[PDB]
């Protein structure tokens, strides 16, 4: 795959995955710092809700 | 839309929470939006960025 890993992961969980449209998707993958980015799942997912109440 | 975004300027420019934001991470957070849209104003950014700092470390 060519998105982080932590991000295909959470994209693959079966609960939290269905949620996150491809749009979320390719907002989150442009988050990075000198290519440091969340690193798990958890990481993403702490991120996208907080995110997903400022641009939704 | 512009490369950085206006609340973002508004951000940096601030003089007491503009320093702690280096060009890397305005570069990092300037790259944030969900189909065009975009966190508003300077207190949003600031929002978004202790919360991503402290994720990346």
Redesign the interface.
């Known amino acids: 795959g060519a998105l982080p890993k932590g991000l295909s992961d959470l994209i693959a969980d079966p609960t939290l995955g269905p949620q996150i449209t491809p ?2 998707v390719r ?1 989150l993958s ?5 290519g ?3 690193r798990d799942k958890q ?1 993403w997912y ?2 996208y809700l ?2 997903k109440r ?3």
Do not use: A, F, N, V
Not at 30 to 34: M, W
């Open positions: 749009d979320w907002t442009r988050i990075e710092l000198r440091k980015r969340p990481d702490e991120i907080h995110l400022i641009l939704s």
